[PDB]
Motif scaffolding. Structure first.
Motif, PDB file in Angstrom:
ATOM      1  N   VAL A 167       6.730 -16.098 -14.049  1.00 47.43           N
ATOM      2  CA  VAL A 167       5.407 -15.508 -13.929  1.00 47.43           C
ATOM      3  C   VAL A 167       4.847 -15.718 -12.529  1.00 47.43           C
ATOM      4  N   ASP A 168       5.156 -16.849 -11.896  1.00 47.27           N
ATOM      5  CA  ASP A 168       4.705 -17.043 -10.525  1.00 47.27           C
ATOM      6  C   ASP A 168       5.357 -16.032  -9.602  1.00 47.27           C
ATOM      7  N   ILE A 169       6.646 -15.776  -9.804  1.00 46.29           N
ATOM      8  CA  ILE A 169       7.326 -14.784  -8.986  1.00 46.29           C
ATOM      9  C   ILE A 169       6.739 -13.399  -9.223  1.00 46.29           C
ATOM     10  N   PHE A 175       1.103  -9.213  -5.715  1.00 48.49           N
ATOM     11  CA  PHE A 175       0.165  -9.454  -4.622  1.00 48.49           C
ATOM     12  C   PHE A 175       0.735  -8.987  -3.289  1.00 48.49           C
ATOM     13  N   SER A 176       1.957  -9.422  -2.982  1.00 50.01           N
ATOM     14  CA  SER A 176       2.637  -9.001  -1.768  1.00 50.01           C
ATOM     15  C   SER A 176       2.644  -7.488  -1.630  1.00 50.01           C
ATOM     16  N   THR A 229       0.175  -3.240   3.386  1.00 52.17           N
ATOM     17  CA  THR A 229      -0.131  -2.131   4.271  1.00 52.17           C
ATOM     18  C   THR A 229      -1.353  -2.394   5.133  1.00 52.17           C
ATOM     19  N   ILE A 230      -1.811  -3.636   5.196  1.00 48.94           N
ATOM     20  CA  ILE A 230      -3.041  -3.987   5.896  1.00 48.94           C
ATOM     21  C   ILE A 230      -2.896  -3.888   7.410  1.00 48.94           C
TER      22      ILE A 230
END
Ligand SMILES: CCCCCCCCCCCCCCCCCC(=O)OC[C@H](CO[C@@H]1O[C@H](CO[C@H]2O[C@H](CO)[C@H](O)[C@H](O)[C@H]2O)[C@H](O)[C@H](O)[C@H]1O)OC(=O)CCCCCCCCCCCCCCCCC
Ligand SMILES: CCCCCCCCCCCCCCCCCC(=O)OC[C@H](CO[C@@H]1O[C@H](CO)[C@H](O)[C@H](O)[C@H]1O)OC(=O)CCCCCCCCCCCCCCCCC
Ligand SMILES: CCCCCCCCCCCCCCCC(=O)OC[C@H](CO[C@@H]1O[C@H](CS(=O)(=O)O)[C@@H](O)[C@H](O)[C@H]1O)OC(=O)CCCCCCCCCCCCCCC
Lengths: 43, 127
Positions: A18-20, A26-27, A32-33
């Motif tokens: 679940v962490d992955i 999120f990644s 695209t920031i």
């Protein structure tokens, strides 16, 4: 029941899967920031 | 395995070129990069065609200049110089001196030596 969870550590009960998954989502959201920021501020 | 220790200098110019390159490699999606790659290829083919046309034109021009030079018969050119012009192996000064030698003494087979490759410029911590 509920007590074996309520009375133990929480990072050992929860898998790493679940962490992955959270990290992947999120990644992918915020990747695209740099291009967006650059193209905005340059007129 | 063979990188000359001069491509690994840490200078103030290179820590900004790092950002340019990291944008191109990690911040741009490979699909747009692919489209740009195709466009740049087509452009380079057009440019090469133009340059080849110009090289052949130069061959006629200098074959004509050697005639003034010798005053008489000589009308040929040098194929060596044509091939050296196509591969960018002449400095501009060498071209000018060859033109002058042709204009004055014909002598189409006397060629300037060859250009040596440009070394990487370094200043200090700056670049
Ligand atoms: C005009 C045609 C646009 C059609 C389209 O569906 O245009 C949408 C495209 C985005 O297209 C997406 O483009 C993706 C490109 O993937 C390809 O490229 C990816 C790397 O870029 C991966 O390698 C993937 O495996 C490979 O197939 C796939 O084609 C998706 O299906 C498609 O939705 O945006 C764009 O035109 C680019 C956005 C520029 C806007 C400024
Ligand atoms: C214009 C910018 C000049 C850069 C052109 C380089 C051309 C070149 O390499 O020529 C070829 C040669 C350089 O020669 C190179 O030298 C190397 C050794 O350092 C090796 O010999 C290489 O083989 C050879 O190519 O250029 C000259 O000989 C010097 C040309 C100087 C031109 C500078 C003009 C700027 C002066 C303006 C200032 C006015 C003040 C009065
Ligand atoms: C604040 C900035 C202050 C500096 C003022 C600028 C000085 C003048 C320009 C410096 C000479 C250029 C050196 C050179 O061309 O290197 C090769 C560089 C890559 O740098 C190179 O890149 C190499 C890694 S790679 O090629 O990018 O993979 C790396 O080996 C190498 O160290 C790195 O230099 O290639 C470029 O295309 C540089 C072109 C940018 C020139 C615009 C200058 C803006 C003014």
């Amino acid at each position: 029941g509920f007590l074996v969870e309520w009375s133990s550590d929480f990072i050992t009960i929860i898998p790493e899967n679940v962490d992955i998954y959270i990290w992947n989502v999120f990644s992918k959201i915020y990747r695209t920031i740099p291009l967006s920021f650059i193209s905005t501020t340059l007129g | 395995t063979d990188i000359p220790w001069a491509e690994k200098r840490w200078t103030l110019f290179s820590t900004v070129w790092y950002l340019v390159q990291q944008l191109r490699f990690v911040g741009t999606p490979p699909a747009l990069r692919y489209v740009a790659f195709l466009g740049w290829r087509a452009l380079m083919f057009q440019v090469y065609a133009a340059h080849k046309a110009l090289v052949l034109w130069q061959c006629k021009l200098d074959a004509g200049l050697a005639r003034i030079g010798s005053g008489g018969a000589t009308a040929t050119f040098s194929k060596t110089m044509a091939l050296r012009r196509l591969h960018w192996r002449n400095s501009p000064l060498a071209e000018a001196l060859y033109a002058l030698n042709l204009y004055k003494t014909g002598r189409v087979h006397l060629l300037p030596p060859v250009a040596k490759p440009i070394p990487r410029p370094t200043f200090f911590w700056l670049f």
